[PDB]
Design an enzyme around this catalytic site. Structure first.
Site, PDB file in Angstrom:
ATOM      1  N   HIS A  68       0.726  -1.135   0.128  1.00  0.00           N
ATOM      2  CA  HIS A  68       0.148   0.038   0.065  1.00  0.00           C
ATOM      3  C   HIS A  68       0.847   1.309  -0.029  1.00  0.00           C
ATOM      4  O   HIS A  68       0.823   2.152   0.925  1.00  0.00           O
ATOM      5  CB  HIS A  68      -0.826  -0.013   1.156  1.00  0.00           C
ATOM      6  CG  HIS A  68      -2.012  -0.975   1.079  1.00  0.00           C
ATOM      7  ND1 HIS A  68      -2.233  -2.102   1.626  1.00  0.00           N
ATOM      8  CD2 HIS A  68      -2.979  -1.035   0.302  1.00  0.00           C
ATOM      9  CE1 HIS A  68      -3.168  -2.737   1.207  1.00  0.00           C
ATOM     10  NE2 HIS A  68      -3.917  -2.091   0.423  1.00  0.00           N
ATOM     11  N   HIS A  72       1.720   1.397  -5.661  1.00  0.00           N
ATOM     12  CA  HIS A  72       0.215   1.037  -5.877  1.00  0.00           C
ATOM     13  C   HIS A  72      -0.802   2.273  -6.326  1.00  0.00           C
ATOM     14  O   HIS A  72      -1.731   2.205  -7.093  1.00  0.00           O
ATOM     15  CB  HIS A  72      -0.204   0.730  -4.308  1.00  0.00           C
ATOM     16  CG  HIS A  72      -1.668   0.365  -4.258  1.00  0.00           C
ATOM     17  ND1 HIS A  72      -2.422  -0.777  -5.168  1.00  0.00           N
ATOM     18  CD2 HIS A  72      -2.597   0.738  -3.659  1.00  0.00           C
ATOM     19  CE1 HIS A  72      -3.717  -0.952  -4.781  1.00  0.00           C
ATOM     20  NE2 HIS A  72      -3.787   0.329  -3.767  1.00  0.00           N
ATOM     21  N   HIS A 106      -5.960   7.457  -2.807  1.00  0.00           N
ATOM     22  CA  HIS A 106      -6.972   6.574  -2.323  1.00  0.00           C
ATOM     23  C   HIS A 106      -6.670   5.726  -1.352  1.00  0.00           C
ATOM     24  O   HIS A 106      -7.232   5.276  -0.552  1.00  0.00           O
ATOM     25  CB  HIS A 106      -7.699   5.698  -3.275  1.00  0.00           C
ATOM     26  CG  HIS A 106      -6.853   4.427  -3.681  1.00  0.00           C
ATOM     27  ND1 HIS A 106      -5.769   4.507  -4.547  1.00  0.00           N
ATOM     28  CD2 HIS A 106      -7.068   3.312  -3.312  1.00  0.00           C
ATOM     29  CE1 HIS A 106      -5.450   3.236  -4.303  1.00  0.00           C
ATOM     30  NE2 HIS A 106      -5.942   2.644  -3.650  1.00  0.00           N
ATOM     31  N   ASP A 107      -5.095   5.688  -1.081  1.00  0.00           N
ATOM     32  CA  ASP A 107      -4.560   4.916   0.051  1.00  0.00           C
ATOM     33  C   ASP A 107      -3.504   5.799   0.879  1.00  0.00           C
ATOM     34  O   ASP A 107      -2.702   5.373   1.750  1.00  0.00           O
ATOM     35  CB  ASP A 107      -3.883   3.588  -0.231  1.00  0.00           C
ATOM     36  CG  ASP A 107      -4.978   2.427  -0.479  1.00  0.00           C
ATOM     37  OD1 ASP A 107      -5.787   2.239   0.303  1.00  0.00           O
ATOM     38  OD2 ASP A 107      -4.485   1.507  -1.259  1.00  0.00           O
ATOM     39  N   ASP A 217      -8.609  -0.586  -8.048  1.00  0.00           N
ATOM     40  CA  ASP A 217      -7.811  -0.956  -6.859  1.00  0.00           C
ATOM     41  C   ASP A 217      -7.232  -2.479  -6.815  1.00  0.00           C
ATOM     42  O   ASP A 217      -6.376  -2.737  -6.160  1.00  0.00           O
ATOM     43  CB  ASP A 217      -8.804  -0.823  -5.790  1.00  0.00           C
ATOM     44  CG  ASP A 217      -8.053  -0.660  -4.420  1.00  0.00           C
ATOM     45  OD1 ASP A 217      -6.736  -0.452  -4.450  1.00  0.00           O
ATOM     46  OD2 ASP A 217      -8.638  -0.723  -3.214  1.00  0.00           O
ATOM     47  N   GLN A 269      -6.198 -17.536  -3.518  1.00  0.00           N
ATOM     48  CA  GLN A 269      -6.151 -16.700  -4.791  1.00  0.00           C
ATOM     49  C   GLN A 269      -7.473 -17.033  -5.501  1.00  0.00           C
ATOM     50  O   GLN A 269      -8.150 -16.244  -6.108  1.00  0.00           O
ATOM     51  CB  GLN A 269      -4.950 -16.574  -5.365  1.00  0.00           C
ATOM     52  CG  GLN A 269      -3.773 -15.650  -4.712  1.00  0.00           C
ATOM     53  CD  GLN A 269      -4.270 -14.376  -4.952  1.00  0.00           C
ATOM     54  OE1 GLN A 269      -4.562 -13.840  -5.939  1.00  0.00           O
ATOM     55  NE2 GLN A 269      -4.535 -13.731  -3.627  1.00  0.00           N
TER      56      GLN A 269
END
Ligand SMILES: Cc1nc2ccccc2nc1CCc1nc(-c2ccccc2)cn1-c1ccccc1
Ligand SMILES: [Mg+2]
Ligand SMILES: [Zn+2]
EC number: 3.1.4.17
Length: 313
Positions: A68, A72, A106-107, A217, A269
């Site tokens: 993050h 990213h 956004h992060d 995202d 996954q």
């Protein structure tokens, strides 16, 4: 004014594709972002000097965490660039302006821990924001940086256009809380299927931008397999440190966060592609047909994780 950004030929061509990887040269990432704003928004959208100062303050407020991080942020903005450029006429001038910034921000100030860990730790942010805890923080950091001197990239908007853009950014950032994605996609599914989906209805547009935010995202699952596979190491490196911290609070973490259960990552996954990723890009492709390459790339990566399970790698 007459000062374009321009990329080397391989980047100039591949940046237009959904699967583009921004590369390991951190110093080129600001220029890549400005290139994208200029082509998707215009050379007139933002004052170069303010936009450059805003980008570098955003970079400085991302932390050195495995996943993050600043890479990213630019990666999620590139996926949005690709969506906007493949759906030229569907989005307003304000939406174009707002969504690349939303993706970049956004992060902001992420610590590498989930909302759940903040609540179990009793972090001050969890008393200030009871749901979407990190995402309300990310929006709060975005407004902080927009209000630093020389950082107001939206200064040329009217008071009402300004409030509208900040409202697009807030909704877009909140939407990146994956807890909210499941219900948003179910609603979009039902609306598309009963033919009630209406892109003039503001509450419908909001939902579609929310799904775009989820798609950008999660865009690591839409890369070339070696990019997908190497990113997954960064993703688990965070979850496993979170797991370590849960064990320090005296709480067995969920298996996704327990490094002692690494072996189960391939099956994990599969669950994630089937429960989250595939449904995400399927509904996105239904609503915005030219985003189909994201769905095709996701399905190719699901097939690669199936090969890992069958020990064919
Ligand atoms: C969150 C997540 N976000 C990603 C974003 C981009 C790319 C890869 C990502 N991988 C994960 C982990 C996806 C996962 N691993 C597990 C897991 C792993 C090892 C041991 C036990 C469980 C479960 N699950 C999961 C399954 C269904 C729904 C939700 C989570
Ligand atoms: Mg986030
Ligand atoms: Zn993110």
């Amino acid at each position: 004014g007459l000062m374009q950004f321009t990329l080397p030929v391989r980047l100039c061509k591949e940046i237009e594709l959904f699967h583009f990887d921004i590369g390991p040269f951190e110093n080129m990432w600001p220029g890549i972002f400005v290139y994208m704003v200029h082509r998707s928004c215009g050379t007139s959208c933002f004052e170069l000097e303010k936009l450059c100062r805003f980008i570098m303050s955003v970079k400085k407020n991302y932390r050195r965490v495995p996943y993050h991080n600043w890479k990213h942020a630019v990666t999620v903005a590139h996926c949005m660039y690709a969506i906007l450029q493949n759906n030229h006429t569907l989005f307003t001038d304000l939406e174009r302006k707002g969504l690349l910034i939303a993706c970049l921000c956004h992060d902001l100030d992420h610590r590498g821990f989930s909302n759940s860990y903040l609540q179990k730790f009793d972090h001050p942010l969890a008393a200030l924001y009871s749901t979407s805890t990190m995402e309300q923080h990310h929006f709060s950091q975005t407004v902080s940086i927009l209000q630093l001197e020389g950082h107001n990239i939206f200064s040329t908007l009217s008071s009402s256009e300004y409030e509208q853009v900040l409202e697009i950014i807030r909704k877009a950032i909140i939407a990146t809380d994956l807890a909210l994605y499941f219900g948003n996609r179910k609603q979009l599914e039902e609306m598309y299927q009963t033919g009630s989906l209406n892109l003039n209805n503001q509450s419908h547009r909001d939902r579609v931008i929310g799904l775009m935010m989820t798609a950008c995202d999660l865009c690591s699952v839409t890369k070339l397999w070696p990019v997908t596979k190497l990113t997954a190491n960064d993703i688990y490196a965070e979850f496993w440190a979170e797991g370590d911290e849960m064990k320090k609070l005296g709480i067995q973490p969920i298996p996704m966060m327990d490094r002692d259960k690494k072996d189960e990552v391939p099956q994990g996954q599969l669950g994630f592609y089937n429960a989250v990723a595939i449904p995400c890009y399927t509904t996105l492709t239904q609503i915005l047909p030219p985003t189909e390459p994201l769905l095709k790339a996701c399905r190719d990566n699901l097939s690669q994780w199936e090969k890992v399970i069958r020990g064919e790698e």
